[PDB]
Design an enzyme around this catalytic site. Structure first.
Site, PDB file in Angstrom:
ATOM      1  N   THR A  19      49.953  47.796  28.025  1.00  0.00           N
ATOM      2  CA  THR A  19      49.401  47.055  26.901  1.00  0.00           C
ATOM      3  C   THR A  19      50.367  45.958  26.468  1.00  0.00           C
ATOM      4  O   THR A  19      51.438  45.774  27.047  1.00  0.00           O
ATOM      5  CB  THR A  19      49.089  47.987  25.728  1.00  0.00           C
ATOM      6  OG1 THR A  19      48.884  47.207  24.546  1.00  0.00           O
ATOM      7  CG2 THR A  19      50.233  48.952  25.497  1.00  0.00           C
TER       8      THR A  19
ATOM      9  N   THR B  25      44.006  47.395  24.286  1.00  0.00           N
ATOM     10  CA  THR B  25      43.159  46.687  23.335  1.00  0.00           C
ATOM     11  C   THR B  25      41.989  46.008  24.027  1.00  0.00           C
ATOM     12  O   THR B  25      42.174  45.013  24.733  1.00  0.00           O
ATOM     13  CB  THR B  25      43.968  45.648  22.561  1.00  0.00           C
ATOM     14  OG1 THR B  25      45.091  46.280  21.937  1.00  0.00           O
ATOM     15  CG2 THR B  25      43.106  45.001  21.495  1.00  0.00           C
TER      16      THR B  25
ATOM     17  N   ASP C 114      44.410  48.648  30.662  1.00  0.00           N
ATOM     18  CA  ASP C 114      44.824  47.871  29.480  1.00  0.00           C
ATOM     19  C   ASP C 114      44.356  48.664  28.228  1.00  0.00           C
ATOM     20  O   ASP C 114      43.439  49.499  28.374  1.00  0.00           O
ATOM     21  CB  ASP C 114      44.172  46.505  29.638  1.00  0.00           C
ATOM     22  CG  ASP C 114      44.302  45.593  28.446  1.00  0.00           C
ATOM     23  OD1 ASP C 114      45.586  45.108  27.986  1.00  0.00           O
ATOM     24  OD2 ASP C 114      43.311  45.217  27.849  1.00  0.00           O
TER      25      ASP C 114
ATOM     26  N   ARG D  22      54.390  46.222  24.307  1.00  0.00           N
ATOM     27  CA  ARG D  22      55.044  44.918  24.236  1.00  0.00           C
ATOM     28  C   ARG D  22      55.292  44.364  25.637  1.00  0.00           C
ATOM     29  O   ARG D  22      56.361  43.831  25.941  1.00  0.00           O
ATOM     30  CB  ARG D  22      56.348  45.002  23.444  1.00  0.00           C
ATOM     31  CG  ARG D  22      56.178  44.918  21.935  1.00  0.00           C
ATOM     32  CD  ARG D  22      55.408  43.670  21.525  1.00  0.00           C
ATOM     33  NE  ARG D  22      55.511  43.405  20.091  1.00  0.00           N
ATOM     34  CZ  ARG D  22      54.705  43.926  19.170  1.00  0.00           C
ATOM     35  NH1 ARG D  22      53.728  44.748  19.524  1.00  0.00           N
ATOM     36  NH2 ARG D  22      54.878  43.625  17.890  1.00  0.00           N
TER      37      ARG D  22
ATOM     38  N   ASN E 256      45.748  38.258  29.658  1.00  0.00           N
ATOM     39  CA  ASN E 256      47.047  38.789  30.043  1.00  0.00           C
ATOM     40  C   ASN E 256      46.947  39.841  31.137  1.00  0.00           C
ATOM     41  O   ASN E 256      47.972  40.211  31.718  1.00  0.00           O
ATOM     42  CB  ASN E 256      47.767  39.379  28.826  1.00  0.00           C
ATOM     43  CG  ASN E 256      46.890  40.308  28.025  1.00  0.00           C
ATOM     44  OD1 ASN E 256      45.678  40.123  27.952  1.00  0.00           O
ATOM     45  ND2 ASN E 256      47.497  41.315  27.412  1.00  0.00           N
TER      46      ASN E 256
ATOM     47  N   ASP F 156      40.718  43.340  30.480  1.00  0.00           N
ATOM     48  CA  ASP F 156      39.623  42.562  29.920  1.00  0.00           C
ATOM     49  C   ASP F 156      40.033  41.210  29.355  1.00  0.00           C
ATOM     50  O   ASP F 156      39.151  40.428  28.990  1.00  0.00           O
ATOM     51  CB  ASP F 156      38.911  43.361  28.820  1.00  0.00           C
ATOM     52  CG  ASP F 156      39.526  43.145  27.459  1.00  0.00           C
ATOM     53  OD1 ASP F 156      40.747  43.356  27.316  1.00  0.00           O
ATOM     54  OD2 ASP F 156      38.786  42.762  26.531  1.00  0.00           O
TER      55      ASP F 156
ATOM     56  N   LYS G 147      53.386  43.214  33.322  1.00  0.00           N
ATOM     57  CA  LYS G 147      52.395  44.137  33.852  1.00  0.00           C
ATOM     58  C   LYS G 147      52.147  43.911  35.333  1.00  0.00           C
ATOM     59  O   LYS G 147      51.551  44.771  35.986  1.00  0.00           O
ATOM     60  CB  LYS G 147      51.079  44.005  33.084  1.00  0.00           C
ATOM     61  CG  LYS G 147      51.246  43.736  31.604  1.00  0.00           C
ATOM     62  CD  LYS G 147      49.962  43.219  30.989  1.00  0.00           C
ATOM     63  CE  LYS G 147      49.103  44.353  30.484  1.00  0.00           C
ATOM     64  NZ  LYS G 147      48.196  43.909  29.401  1.00  0.00           N
TER      65      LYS G 147
HETATM   66 MG   LIG Z   1      42.282  42.791  25.442  1.00  0.00          MG
END
Ligand SMILES: [Mg+2]
Ligand SMILES: CCCCCCCCCCCCCCCCCC(=O)OC[C@H](COP(=O)(O)OC[C@H](N)C(=O)O)OC(=O)CCCCCCCCCCCCCCCCC
Ligand SMILES: CC(=O)N[C@@H]1[C@@H](O)[C@H](O)[C@@H](CO)O[C@H]1O
Ligand SMILES: CC(=O)N[C@@H]1[C@@H](O)[C@H](O)[C@@H](CO)O[C@H]1O
Ligand SMILES: CC(=O)N[C@@H]1[C@@H](O)[C@H](O)[C@@H](CO)O[C@H]1O
Ligand SMILES: *[C@@H]1O[C@H](CO)[C@@H](O)[C@H](O)[C@H]1NC(C)=O
Ligand SMILES: OC[C@H]1OC[C@@H](O)[C@@H](O)[C@@H]1O
Lengths: 324, 814
Positions: free
Chosen positions: B413, B385, B383, B512, B542, B539, B518
Site C-alpha cells: 500500500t 486503498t 493494493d 508508505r 501507483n 486499481d 512496490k
Molecule cells: Mg487506490
C-alpha cells in the site's frame, strides 16, 4: 450479460465419463477372451498352408544352377529337383523372390513415368525427367522409361512332374490374372489409338536392358504392352529389400485330385537375371492360400501373446484390487 | 530548470500531452514484433533451415520450410497487432477527451491531448486534472481547493492546496487574459511530494513579485478535484513528464511459463533430430562404402550426380534427413497455440460472474498471451486503498481462498502503517494471535539498529518458532535501508536475511510504499530460488509499476481512474473476482494448453519414428515411408481439430467444483503437467508406439500374400498401414484423455476418423489428371480388401494403447 448462453458461460451439456478402476477390469477379460480364440483360429490356418521355396541363385559348386553364374554362351539353362511330400490341395500360387534387391530406393521408386504408362499421347514421346538415366538412347525416348521398367525380372521358371514313367508331365501355369485388377484395367493403359500395338509406339525405343520391345512382350492383344501382367507386377515396388512377386498361378482341377500331387518335380529355369553382382539371392516359391493370405505365424502368435497377457493382467489387477 | 509562460505568450521544447499504454507504434511494430517471435526456438530453426535451402542446391525446395514459417509469423502478428490496436483505442477515448481552456478571452474547448505547457486550463468539481497544473485561482476566495489523490499515492483523505496570492482574484476568463507571469519550475521528477518553482508576475510599470511555488500549489495529474466549483491551473508538465507518468517503469515482454517450456521441449527435440539425421548419415556412408551398395546396376546415377564432390554430398545428405524428419519440431503448434489463446480469452469477457451492476461492465482482456499462467501464480501482491477497501464485498473471504490454494498474499500500500495494518487486520490478513514483526520506522529509528533486529527476528526468532503465528510489517523508509544501503555490505547481506523472513511469514504488509518501491518488492520475489509466478492486482496509478513488473498483472476497474485497467493484462471490476479468475479460469486455461503441447510432440514423434526406422530397410536413401498428400495433411487435416476443440471447451474438473474447492489449485502448481516426469512418459510412449506401428507391419509383410487371391503389396501399402494405425492411435489417445465430452468433442474426434477414411477412399480412386505420380490409386481400397490387414490394424491399435490403458487402471486407484 444477455450473452449468458450455455456455450459462452462454459456450461455446455457434456458426458463426463469417470473411467474408474472398477469398470475396466471387465475390459482386460473381454479382450483376452476374444483374442485367444482368434490367435488360435488364425494360427492353425497359418499352419495348414503348404508352401515350398527352392533357391536357385547358384553360388554353390554343387548347385545344378551354378554352371551359369557367369556363362559364356547364353541363354543358360538349369534344372532343379524338389520333392512334395504332402500334395497341395487348393489352387497354388507360384512366386519368385529376391534378396538384397532395393526396389524401395528413393532414386529407384521415383524412376517411372506414371503419365506415360497411362496411355498419355504426349508423355509417350517426351518422357519425364525423373526417369533420367534410362530416359533416352539413340536420341529416341525409351518407351517404358525409368529404372523400374528397365530391370524387369525375366527368368523363365517351368515346372514338371516326374510321373510313374521317366517322362515328365508339365503342369500348366496360368499367366493372366496376377496384377491388381485396378492397376491393369485402369492405371496401366496402352497408348491412345491404333489397330496393332506395333504402331502406337512409333518414335519410342525399347529399354536398354530388354531384348524385345514393349509391343512384343506377349502374343495376347490384352497382355501385350503396358498391360502385361509380368510387367504390371514388377512395376509395383516391393517396400523391403527381400520381396516376393506373383509369377504364375496353378488353377485347381475340376476333379477332386490335388493341384500338385506329392512326388518328384523338375524346376528347369532359363537363367537370365543376374542377381549375384550385388549379393542377392533368387528363389521360387509355391504355396496355397487362405482367407488370411499366406503362411505367416505373426498374427497367430501375436493375438495369443496379447490376448493372454490381458487375461492375466486382468486377474492380477483383480486380486490386488480385491484385497479391499 | 524549464521556464513556462503563463498564457503561452511573451511577457517549445516541451513534450505533448498524450497517453501511451500500448507497446508498438506504427513504425517499430515489425522490428519489435519479429524479435519477439524469434524468441521461440522453432521460428529460429525454421528460418535457418530455410536460409540454407536458398543458398545451396538441395533435392528439396525452399517452400517446405518457408511456407509454414511465413504463416506462423503472420498469424501471431495479426493477433499481437490487433490486440495492441485495441490498446490504441483505449488511449483514444482518453486523449480525445474534452478539457476547456482560456485561449484568448474565450473559453475554448480543446482535447485532453492538445494541451501545451503554459495554457490556463480549468477544471470542474469531480473532474480529474489532465496535466500537472499549478493552481492560479479558485472560484471561491481564500484561493484553496480540495484534492483527493486516492489513486496517485493510495491516500484516501482530501488534501488542501493553495492558490497564488497574486491571482486569487482572477476569474471570468477575461481577467486571466491580463496575466503576465513566468514560471521557472524544476525538471520533471518522480518524487511526487517535492517541487520548486517561481512566479514573477509582471505589472505594467514594474513588479518583481516572486511568490516561490511549492508542493502545496502543484495540482498533480490523476488527482480528482473534490468540493469546489472550479479552478484555473497553468499546465506545467504535460504527459510522459508528469509526476504520475514518471513512476511508470516501462513495458517489457511477458511470456508465460508454458511458452518457456515449449522451448525446453524444443531443445530436447533438436537433439533427437540431430541424432536421427546424424545416425542416418554416419550409417548411409558406411553402407554405401561397398561398391555394389550404391549403383547396383538396377538403379544407376546420372552423370551429374556422379561428379558431385563427396565432401558436399555428406552435407546435402545430412540436410536432407533434417528436412525429412523436420516434422518432429512442430511449427503447426504455434498456429493452434494462438488460435486457442485468442478464442479462449473470450470466456473471461463473456463470464457473467464478472459483471458489476453498479459500474455496468465485466472483466477485460488486454493480452491473451498469459491466459495459461493465471493458474500458476505463487505470490499475489495486492493494493489496499480501493482494491481491498471498510473492507469490500468479500475482500476477506477471498484472501482465505488465496491462502487455501497455497498462494502468498502481500499487501503493498501507500497509506499509513497502522491505518493500513488495520484494513489488513480487518481483511483478516493479520489475525488477532499473529506475532507481528514490525520493521517500520517506529522501531528502527537508526541506521545500525535495524541489523540488531533483522537477524534478531530471523536467525533466532522466526525459524526457531508458524503460519498464523507471525506476520511482517515494513515501510518505504526502512525498505530503502534494506535495498539501497544493503547493496554494499555483503559480509551478511541485509537483503538476504530480510528475504528469509518474508518467505517464512504468513502474510506481509508494506506501508508508505512509493510507486517504484512496490516494483522492487515484486522484483525481489521474482528472483529468489526459482521463478515464483507473481500476480499484482491494483486499481490506481501507483500500482502500474508493480503491474508491468509481475508475471501476470491484474487491474481493478474502479471509480478513481482507469490508469491500471489499461497497463494490465486483465481487469475485473472487483477484488473478489480474483477467486474465480485464478481458481476456475487459470486452472482450466493452464490444463488445456499444457495438454496441447504435450500431445503436439507425442503426435509428431509417433509420425516420424516409423519413418526413421524405415531408412534401415531402405538404402538409407531418405525415402519417405508415407505418401506426400499424407505427410502434409496429417498435422493440418487429420489431427488438427480434435486437439483444438479440446484446448478450448474441455474441463477436466467441473468449473463449479474448482471454484468452491480451492485446494485443487495446488495440484497443477509448479508446472505439473510440463515437468520432466510427464515429459518422459509422452516421449517414451511415442517411441514405444512409433516402434509398434512399423515393426508390427514389418512382421506382417513376411507372408508373400495378405489376401485370398495371392496378390502382393508394394511400399505404398506398407506406408498406409503404418499411417492408418497411426491416425487411429493418436486420435483414440485423446478420446481417452477427454473427461468433458461435449457435442463438439463427439463431432471432431469421430469426424476426423471418418474423414481420413473418406478422403483416402476418394483421393485414391480417381486418376487425377493434374498429378504426375498417380501412385496412390487404389492403395487404400485394396489395403482394406484383406482380412489379415483388418486383424492387424485392430491389434496394433490395442498394443499401442495398452500403456495408456494400464495406466488408467493403476493411476486411477488410490
Ligand atoms: Mg487506490
Ligand atoms: C488436398 C490435397 C493436397 C495434396 C498435396 C500434395 C502435394 C504436397 C507437396 C508437398 C510440398 C509442400 C506443399 C505445400 C506445403 C504446405 C504447408 C502448409 O500449408 O503448412 C501450414 C501449417 C503447417 O503445416 P505442417 O503440416 O504442420 O508442416 C509443418 C512442418 N514443420 C513443415 O516442415 O512443413 O499447418 C497449419 O497451419 C495448421 C492449422 C491448424 C488449424 C486447423 C485448420 C483446419 C483445416 C481444415 C480441417 C478439415 C478437417 C475435416 C473435419 C471434418 C469434420 C469434423
Ligand atoms: C541328382 C541330379 O542332380 N539329377 C537327377 C536326375 O538325373 C534325375 C532326376 C529325376 O529323378 O533327379 C535329379
Ligand atoms: C546389368 C547386367 O547384368 N549387364 C547386362 C548388360 O551389359 C546387357 O547389355 C543387358 C542386355 O543388353 O543385360 C544386362
Ligand atoms: C530378355 C532376355 O532373354 N535377356 C535379358 C538380358 O539381355 C538382360 O541382360 C537381363 C537383365 O539384365 O534380362 C534378360
Ligand atoms: C526341364 O528341364 C530339363 C533339364 O534336364 C530339360 O530337359 C528341359 O528344359 C525340361 N525337360 C522337359 C522334359 O521338358
Ligand atoms: O557389356 C556391356 C554391354 O552394355 C550394353 C550392351 O548393349 C552392349 O553394348 C555391351 O556389351
Amino acid at each position: 450479460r444477455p450473452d449468458n448462453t450455455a456455450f459462452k458461460q462454459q456450461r455446455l451439456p457434456a458426458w463426463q465419463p469417470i473411467l474408474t478402476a472398477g469398470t475396466v477390469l471387465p475390459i482386460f477379460f473381454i479382450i483376452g477372451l476374444i483374442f485367444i480364440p482368434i490367435g488360435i483360429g488364425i494360427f492353425v490356418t497359418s499352419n495348414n498352408i503348404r508352401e515350398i521355396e527352392i533357391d536357385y541363385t547358384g553360388t554353390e559348386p554343387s548347385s545344378p544352377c551354378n554352371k551359369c553364374l557367369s556363362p559364356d554362351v547364353t541363354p543358360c539353362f538349369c534344372t532343379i529337383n524338389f520333392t512334395l511330400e504332402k500334395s497341395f490341395e487348393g489352387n497354388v500360387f507360384m512366386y519368385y523372390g529376391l534378396s538384397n534387391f532395393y526396389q524401395n530406393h528413393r532414386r529407384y521408386v521415383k524412376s517411372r513415368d506414371d503419365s506415360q504408362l497411362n496411355g498419355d499421347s504426349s508423355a509417350l514421346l517426351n518422357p519425364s525427367k525423373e526417369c533420367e538415366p534410362y530416359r533416352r538412347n539413340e536420341d529416341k525416348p525409351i518407351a517404358p522409361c525409368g529404372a523400374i521398367m528397365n530391370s524387369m525380372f525375366n527368368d523363365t521358371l517351368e515346372l514338371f512332374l516326374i510321373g510313374q514313367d521317366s517322362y515328365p508331365i508339365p503342369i500348366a501355369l496360368k499367366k493372366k490374372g496376377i496384377a491388381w485388377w485396378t492397376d491393369k484395367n485402369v492405371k496401366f493403359r496402352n497408348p491412345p489409338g491404333g489397330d496393332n500395338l506395333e504402331e502406337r509406339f512409333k518414335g519410342t525405343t525399347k529399354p536398354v536392358n530388354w531384348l524385345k520391345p514393349v509391343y512384343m512382350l506377349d502374343s495376347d492383344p490384352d497382355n501385350n504392352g503396358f498391360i502385361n501382367e509380368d510387367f504390371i507386377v514388377w512395376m509395383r515396388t516391393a517396400a523391403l529389400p527381400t520381396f516376393r512377386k506373383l509369377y504364375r498361378l496353378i488353377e485347381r482341377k475340376s476333379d477332386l485330385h490335388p493341384t500338385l500331387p506329392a512326388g518328384r518335380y523338375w524346376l528347369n529355369v532359363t537363367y537370365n537375371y543376374p542377381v549375384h553382382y550385388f549379393d542377392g539371392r533368387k528363389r521360387m516359391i509355391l504355396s496355397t492360400i487362405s482367407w488370411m493370405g499366406g503362411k505367416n505365424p505373426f498374427l497367430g502368435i501375436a493375438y495369443i501373446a496379447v490376448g493372454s497377457i490381458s487375461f492375466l493382467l486382468g486377474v492380477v489387477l483383480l486380486v490386488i484390487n480385491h484385497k479391499y | 530548470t524549464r521556464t513556462v509562460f503563463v498564457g503561452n505568450h511573451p511577457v517549445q521544447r516541451f513534450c505533448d500531452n498524450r497517453i501511451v499504454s500500448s507497446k508498438y507504434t506504427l513504425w517499430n511494430f515489425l522490428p519489435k514484433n519479429l524479435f519477439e517471435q524469434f524468441r521461440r526456438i522453432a521460428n529460429f530453426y525454421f528460418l535457418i533451415i530455410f536460409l540454407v535451402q536458398v543458398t545451396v542446391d538441395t533435392p528439396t525446395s525452399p517452400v517446405t520450410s518457408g511456407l509454414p514459417l511465413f504463416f506462423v509469423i503472420t498469424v501471431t502478428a495479426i493477433k499481437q497487432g490487433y490486440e495492441d490496436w485495441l490498446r490504441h483505442r483505449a488511449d483514444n477515448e482518453v486523449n480525445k477527451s474534452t478539457v476547456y481552456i482560456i485561449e484568448n478571452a474565450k473559453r475554448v474547448r480543446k482535447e485532453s491531448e492538445k494541451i501545451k505547457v503554459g495554457d490556463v486550463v480549468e477544471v470542474q468539481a469531480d473532474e480529474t486534472f489532465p496535466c500537472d497544473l499549478i493552481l492560479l485561482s479558485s472560484c471561491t476566495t481564500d484561493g484553496t481547493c480540495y484534492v483527493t489523490t486516492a489513486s496517485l499515492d493510495g491516500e484516501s483523505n482530501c488534501k488542501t492546496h493553495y492558490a497564488v496570492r497574486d491571482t486569487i482574484a482572477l476569474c471570468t476568463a477575461e481577467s486571466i487574459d491580463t496575466l503576465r507571469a513566468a514560471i521557472e519550475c524544476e525538471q520533471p521528477q518522480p518524487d511526487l511530494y517535492k517541487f520548486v518553482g517561481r512566479i514573477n508576475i509582471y505589472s505594467n510599470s514594474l513588479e518583481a513579485v516572486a511568490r516561490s511555488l511549492g508542493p502545496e500549489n502543484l495540482l498533480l495529474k490523476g488527482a480528482t478535484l473534490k468540493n469546489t466549483e472550479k479552478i484555473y491551473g497553468v499546465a506545467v508538465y504535460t504527459g510522459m513528464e508528469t509526476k504520475m507518468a514518471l513512476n511508470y517503469q516501462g513495458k517489457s515482454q511477458k511470456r508465460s511459463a508454458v511458452e518457456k517450456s515449449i522451448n525446453a521441449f524444443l531443445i530436447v527435440y533438436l537433439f533427437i533430430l540431430l541424432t536421427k539425421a546424424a545416425v542416418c548419415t554416419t550409417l548411409k556412408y558406411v553402407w554405401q562404402s561397398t561398391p555394389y551398395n550404391d549403383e547396383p546396376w538396377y538403379n544407376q546415377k546420372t552423370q551429374k550426380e556422379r561428379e558431385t564432390l563427396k565432401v558436399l554430398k555428406m552435407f546435402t545428405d545430412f540436410l536432407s534427413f533434417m528436412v525429412l524428419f523436420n516434422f518432429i519440431i512442430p511449427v503447426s503448434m504455434y498456429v493452434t497455440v494462438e488460435m486457442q489463446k485468442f478464442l479462449g480469452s473470450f470466456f473471461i469477457s463473456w463470464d457473467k460472474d464478472f459483471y458489476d451492476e453498479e459500474i455496468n461492465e465485466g472483466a477485460l482482456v488486454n493480452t491473451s498471451d498469459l491466459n495459461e499462467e493465471l493458474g500458476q501464480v505463487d505470490y499475489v501482491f495486492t493494493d489496499k486503498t480501493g482494491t481491498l477497501t471498510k473492507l469490500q464485498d468479500q475482500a476477506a473471504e477471498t484472501i482465505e481462498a488465496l491462502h487455501a490454494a497455497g498462494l502468498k498474499v502481500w499487501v503493498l500500500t501507500g497509506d499509513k502503517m497502522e491505518t493500513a495494518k488495520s484494513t489488513c487486520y480487518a481483511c483478516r490478513l493479520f489475525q488477532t494471535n499473529t506475532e507481528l514483526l514490525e520493521l517500520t520506522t517506529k522501531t528502527i529509528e537508526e541506521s545500525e539498529r535495524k541489523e540488531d533486529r533483522l537477524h534478531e527476528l530471523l536467525i533466532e526468532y522466526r525459524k526457531k518458532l508458524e503460519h498464523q503465528e507471525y506476520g511482517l510489517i515494513i515501510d518505504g523508509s526502512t525498505l530503502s535501508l534494506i535495498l539501497n544501503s544493503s547493496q554494499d555490505s555483503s559480509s551478511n547481506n541485509y537483503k538476504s536475511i530480510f528475504l528469509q523472513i518474508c518467505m517464512k511469514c504468513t502474510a506481509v504488509l508494506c506501508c508508505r510504499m512509493a510507486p517504484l518501491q512496490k516494483a522492487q518488492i515484486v522484483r525481489m520475489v521474482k528472483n529468489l530460488k526459482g521463478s515464483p509466478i507473481t500476480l499484482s492486482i491494483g486499481d490506481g496509478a501507483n500500482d502500474v509499476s508493480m503491474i508491468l513488473e509481475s508475471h501476470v498483472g491484474i487491474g481493478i476497474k474502479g471509480k478513481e481512474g482507469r490508469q491500471a485497467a489499461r497497463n494490465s493484462d486483465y481487469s475485473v471490476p472487483k477484488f473478489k473476482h480474483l477467486k474465480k479468475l485464478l481458481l476456475a479460469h487459470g486452472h482450466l486455461y493452464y490444463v488445456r494448453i499444457a495438454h496441447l503441447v504435450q500431445y503436439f510432440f507425442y503426435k509428431n514423434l509417433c509420425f516420424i519414428l516409423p519413418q526413421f526406422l524405415y531408412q534401415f530397410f531402405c538404402g538409407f536413401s531418405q525415402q519417405p515411408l508415407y505418401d506426400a498428400a499424407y505427410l502434409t495433411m496429417y498435422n493440418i487435416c487429420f489431427t488438427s481439430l480434435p486437439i483444438l476443440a479440446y484446448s478450448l471447451l474441455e474441463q477436466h474438473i467441473n468449473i463449479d467444483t474448482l471454484t468452491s474447492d480451492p485446494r485443487l489449485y495446488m495440484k497443477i502448481s509448479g508446472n505439473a503437467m510440463l515437468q520432466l516426469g510427464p515429459f518422459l512418459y509422452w516421449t517414451f510412449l511415442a517411441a514405444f508406439e512409433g516402434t509398434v506401428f512399423f515393426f508390427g507391419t514389418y512382421f506382417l509383410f513376411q507372408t508373400a500374400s495378405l489376401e485370398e487371391n495371392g496378390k502382393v503389396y508394394g511400399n505404398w501399402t506398407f506406408g498406409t498401414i503404418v499411417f492408418t494405425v497411426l491416425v487411429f492411435t493418436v486420435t483414440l489417445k485423446l478420446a481417452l484423455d477427454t473427461r468433458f465430452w461435449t457435442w463438439i468433442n463427439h463431432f471432431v474426434i469421430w469426424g476426423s476418423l471418418a474423414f481420413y477414411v473418406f478422403f483416402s477412399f476418394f483421393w485414391g480412386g480417381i486418376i487425377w489428371p493434374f498429378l504426375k505420380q498417380q501412385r496412390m490409386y487404389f492403395v487404400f481400397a485394396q489395403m482394406l480388401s484383406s482380412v489379415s490387414t483388418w486383424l492387424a490394424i485392430i491389434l496394433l491399435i490395442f498394443i499401442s494403447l495398452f500403456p495408456e490403458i494400464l495406466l488408467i487402471v493403476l493411476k486411477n486407484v488410490r
